Amino acid sequence: MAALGVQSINWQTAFNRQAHHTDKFSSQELILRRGQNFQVLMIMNKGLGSNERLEFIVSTGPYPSESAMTKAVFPLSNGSSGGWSAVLQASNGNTLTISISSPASAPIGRYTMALQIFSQGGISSVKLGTFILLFNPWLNVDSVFMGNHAEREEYVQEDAGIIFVGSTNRIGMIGWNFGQFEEDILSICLSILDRSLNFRRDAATDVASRNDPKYVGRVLSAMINSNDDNGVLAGNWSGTYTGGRDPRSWNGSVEILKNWKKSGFSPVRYGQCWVFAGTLNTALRSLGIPSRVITNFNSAHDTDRNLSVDVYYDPMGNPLDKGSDSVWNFHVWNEGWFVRSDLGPSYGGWQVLDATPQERSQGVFQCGPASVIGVREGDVQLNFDMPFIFAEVNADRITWLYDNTTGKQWKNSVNSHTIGRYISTKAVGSNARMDVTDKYKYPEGSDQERQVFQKALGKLKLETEEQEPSIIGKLKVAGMLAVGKEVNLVLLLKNLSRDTKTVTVNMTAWTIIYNGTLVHEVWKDSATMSLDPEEEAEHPIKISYAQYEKYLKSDNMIRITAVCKVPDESEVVVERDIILDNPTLTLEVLNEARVRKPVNVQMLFSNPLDEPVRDCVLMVEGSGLLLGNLKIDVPTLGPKEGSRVRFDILPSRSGTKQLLADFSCNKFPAIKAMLSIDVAE
Amino acid sequence: NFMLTQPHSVSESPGKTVTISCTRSSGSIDSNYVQWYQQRPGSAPTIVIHEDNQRPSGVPDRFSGSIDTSSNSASLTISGLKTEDEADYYCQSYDPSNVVFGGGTKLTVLGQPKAAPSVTLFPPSSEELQANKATLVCLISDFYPGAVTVAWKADSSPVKAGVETTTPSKQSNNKYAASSYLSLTPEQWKSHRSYSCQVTHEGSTVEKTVAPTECS
Amino acid sequence: EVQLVESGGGLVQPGRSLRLSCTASGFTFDDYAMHWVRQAPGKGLEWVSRISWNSRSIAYADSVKGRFTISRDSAKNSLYLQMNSLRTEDTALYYCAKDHYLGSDSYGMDVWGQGTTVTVSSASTKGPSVFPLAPSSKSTSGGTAALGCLVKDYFPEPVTVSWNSGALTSGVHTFPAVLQSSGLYSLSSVVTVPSSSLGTQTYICNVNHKPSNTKVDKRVEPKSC
Ligand SMILES: [Ca+2]
Ligand SMILES: [Ca+2]
Ligand SMILES: [Ca+2]
Ligand SMILES: [Cl-]
C-alpha cells in the first residue's frame, strides 16, 4: 500500500558519455549532447500501478520557463513525438529502464533533473541530479552538424594544435595546447556564459539563446577578451609586458582559463591575437562547436569602412605611425562550423569569430559570426562584422610619403593584392599547413576579385599616373638571421630607363612588434648610386648585434626600409620585414611512451652568445602527457655552454600527443619547442 | 571572507604516508588556488605546493597536493616519510581581497612510543590572592607526540580570555611538556564552583579540576 | 636566486611608529605583487598586506587597516610598511614575501625573507614575584607528587630556576615563559618528587633574574588541607 517513491538512480555515466562522445573530459559529471537519447535505470519502491504516473522536469539557468525552452515537463511514456521525451524501455521488479531524450534545439549548459510522482491522488517532486548538455556535431539535425568523421575528430576532439605565424617571407608555426579535456576547463568555459554582459543584464533571455551557436559563438568572441566585461585575457601589443607574461611565452589555453577563474575572474596578462584565438578555440571545441584557428598574413585593420588602408613613410625612409588603420604581419582568428538560419542555406559552414579586441560591434569588443562564403562573394551587408573582416583579408593598401616639415603628404602607390595572403590552418590529422585563401577571396589578379571588391565597397557608406619608374628595387637577405649575429642584407637597384640615373637612397631599420607597432630605430644610412641604362647595383646593409640587441622584442622582427629617388620622378619605396632565429631548443623522449608509465624527456639548449644567460626558466605542458604546467629552474649558462635538463612526464591518454616547451632567459624571451609523442597503449 | 581549518597535529612513522587537510569555511575550495608551506624552527616558511597541486623546483616528488570538492578541502600528502619531514605545515588561499592562512599543523614523524600527558593543575596560592591576583597553573608533562590542545572551563563552560599557553618543548627525557595559565580576579576565583584544565592529546582528554572551597 | 632583506625592525612603546623596509633582488620586482606576513612568537602565520605589481591595488588585514600603509619603489626595488599607532599585539617577526603569480591576481608567497623583529611593549626592567605551587592534600602516600614555583611578571627574559641550590635536577622541568598582555613574562618550574618525603625535607626554588640583579628564594610547603 506504500505510496510510489524513487529509491535510487543509475545514470550509467561511463556508458552514456562514450555514446555521446564526451568521455574524454576529465570530469565526474554526466556530460551529454543535445538531440540524443541517454539511458538510466531508476529503482522505485513498488511496481507502477494504474492511477500512477511519473513526469520528468528539466531546467537550466536561474529563470527557467517552458515557453523559452529552458524548462521542460515530460511524462514517462512510450511516445517520443518532439521536445524532451522519456521512454519506458522495460520494467523488471521495481526497476525501470528509461531512455531520456532532449531536442536538437535545446539550450546548452548545466541542467537539473527532477521527478514528479503521481500516486494515491498525491503529487510530489524529488531532485534526481544534474547534467551538462552540449552541442551535438554528430547529429544530422543539429545546427553544428559536421558529417565527416575525420574532420569532426580534428575540429572537436583534438586538444593539440598548431597556429601559423611569422611573415609572408617565412611562415613558422607554434604548438598550442587547447586542453579542452583538462580538469575544470569545460566547467570554466560554461562559466564564461554565466558572466557575460548579456547574462548579467537579462539572464532569462541569455540562457534561452544558448540553443543558438551563432549567439554562443558571438558571446565567446566578447568574453575571451578582458575589455568591457572582465573577460579572460588582457591584450598588450606595446612591447612592454611588465606585470604579466610576454604573450609569446604562453603555450596553451589551460593555464590562461584556470588563472582567470582562480583570480576571481580577473583578466590574465597578457595576450596577442594567437593567444585569444587559441583560448577561443578551446571554449568552442569544449562546448561542441567544431572550430579551427586561421592565420591571415598581411592582415589589414580598416577603421573607417572603406576597404583601404594607408601606410606612411618619411623621405628619410622611416615608417610612420600615422592614421588609425594598420597592416599586421599576420593576424589570427577562428572559424566555427554551423548553419546560418539567419542568412540562408548558401551561407552555412565556416563562420569567422574573433576574440581579439579590434573594433566595437554594437558597443562591445566582439566579432562575428561572419560567413566565410559570404565574405568571398563580398555580401558584406550580412550579420556579423563583415566590413571589418573583408578588409582584413582583402583591403587595398595605399602607400604615402609624409614630410612633417612641410605638412605635405603625397600618394606613392596602390597595392591591390598584398593584403591577405597564405591564409592558413592546420591540416586534418597532421601538422601540415592547409591554405584556405581561396575560401576567403577570388584569386588575386582575376576579374572576379576586382568585381567582388567593388560590390563590397558599393555596399558601404585626383592623381596623375606618372611614367613607369626608372628604378626598380628589392631587398635580399645575405646569410643567416639569428639573434646574437649580425644582420646582412643587400639592396638591389636597377635603372630601366634609357638615360644614366643618379639614385639617392635613405635607409632605416626599426624593431617592430608583429602588428607593426614601431619600437625603436636601430640603424640608418644614406647612399647615392649612379646607374647606367639597364645597370643593376648592390648596396650592402649591415646591422650589428650591439645595434639591435637592446630594442629587439620577443617578436625578433626588424623592419628594413629604403626610400629611393631620382630627379623628376616619384620616390620608390622598397620594404622588407625580417625575422631573426632564436637559438635552438630541442626536446626528446629517451624511451617509447606508454600510457600510465613514467618516461624521461631531455631538453637541450646551447647559449650561442659570448655572454652568459641568466634567469633561465623552462615551462612545459601537453595534454595527455603531463597534468598542468611544469616549471624548471635552469642555472645560469656560460657563453657557448649547453644545458641538458631531464624531467619525467606520465602519459595518460594513448594516441599522438604534443609536448610543448618555453625556454625564457634574460637575453632570449620565449624560445619555443614542440615534440610529437606517440603514446602506445 | 573565509577561514582555513587544519588539524592541530598529525603523526606517522618513517616510510609511511600522512595527509594534512585544509577545510575552507565558506565559498568553494575550488574557487581559488591553494598553496602549502613548510616551516622549521628558526626559519622562514618555504613553499612546497603551489596552484593546488604543482611542485616547485627542488621539492621531492614525495610531496603532493590535491583538492576535494565534496569536503571543501585541500590536502597535502607526504609519502615515504623521513625524519627531516617533521615540521609545521600551513595551507593558504585568498579571495580577490584577502590572503588567508590555515592555523598550521605540526607533523611528528614517530621516533618513540606515544605517551599520554600527565596533568597537574594548581589553584591560586594564598600569597597571590593576598596580592589581589589569581593564576590557575596547568602543567602538562611526559607526552609524545609534542602537541596538545588545552581548554579551560569555568564551572562547565568554556573560558578563553586570560589564557596563555606555551608550545611543547622537550624535557630531559626526550618527551615533551607544556604549560597553560588562566588569569582571574580573586572574585572570579571565589565566586565559581570550580575551574578545569582539559588537555587533549592524540584524541584523548585528561581533565583536572580545582575549587576555592577545596582549601577547607 | 631571489633575495628579500627586511630592515627597520626594533622596540617601540605602544602608540609610536616604525617603518619597515624590504630590499628585493634576483627577479624583476615590478612584475609581482608583494606582501607582508607576520608571525608572533610561538604562533601561526598572519597575512598583513598586499600591493599589486603597479601599486594600484592594495589590501590590508582588518587588524591593521587604517594604521599600516604598504608601498613600494621601483627604482629602489624595495617594499615598505609604515606602521603607526603600534599596539602590543603587533609584536611579531615581519616577513617580506614575493608573490608566486605572474600576470594574474591570485596570491601565493614563493619566496620569503628571514624577517625583521618588531616588539611593542611599555615594560621596564623588573624582577619577578615568586609564588608557591604547593603539593596537594592527596599526596600523603601512594606514589609521586608535583610541586612548583610560579615566577610572575619579570622583564626582560630570561630567568633560570634551580632547586635546592642545584642539589636536585631529577624530575625537574622549567617551562618556556609566556608573555602577558601586560608586556611582562611569567614561567613555572616543576619537580615531581616522592609523596613520602613531603614532611621532612625542604623544597626551595631559587630564581635568578640577572637583568634585575635579583635572586629570590621561595620555600614551597605542602597544603594545610
Ligand atoms: Ca570582453
Ligand atoms: Ca580605411
Ligand atoms: Ca586583393
Ligand atoms: Cl625573414
XYZ file of N, CA, C and O and ligand atoms in Angstrom, chain A residues 393-396 416-419 441 444 449-450, ligand 3:
49
model
N 41.134 40.620 -45.018
C 41.645 39.682 -45.997
C 41.763 40.337 -47.378
O 42.362 39.755 -48.303
N 41.126 41.499 -47.582
C 41.144 41.977 -48.946
C 41.085 43.491 -49.142
O 40.717 43.903 -50.202
N 41.533 44.272 -48.188
C 41.612 45.698 -48.361
C 42.706 46.000 -49.352
O 43.695 45.258 -49.455
N 42.550 47.145 -50.010
C 43.636 47.671 -50.824
C 44.540 48.472 -49.902
O 44.105 48.941 -48.851
N 46.928 46.213 -54.623
C 45.578 45.730 -54.549
C 45.586 44.233 -54.262
O 44.539 43.643 -54.185
N 46.767 43.646 -54.141
C 46.945 42.217 -53.994
C 47.798 41.860 -52.769
O 47.976 40.676 -52.552
N 48.396 42.826 -52.022
C 49.380 42.489 -50.984
C 48.715 42.025 -49.666
O 49.248 41.159 -48.979
N 47.552 42.612 -49.332
C 46.752 42.242 -48.182
C 46.117 40.866 -48.341
O 45.423 40.583 -49.329
N 38.638 34.672 -50.712
C 38.671 35.655 -51.802
C 38.777 34.913 -53.119
O 39.335 33.810 -53.152
N 43.806 36.613 -56.610
C 44.383 37.910 -56.897
C 44.710 37.956 -58.398
O 45.294 37.003 -58.930
N 37.803 39.133 -58.589
C 38.341 39.664 -57.348
C 38.062 41.165 -57.328
O 37.774 41.748 -56.290
N 38.162 41.789 -58.504
C 38.033 43.237 -58.604
C 36.553 43.599 -58.577
O 36.207 44.586 -57.958
Ca 43.162 41.883 -53.292
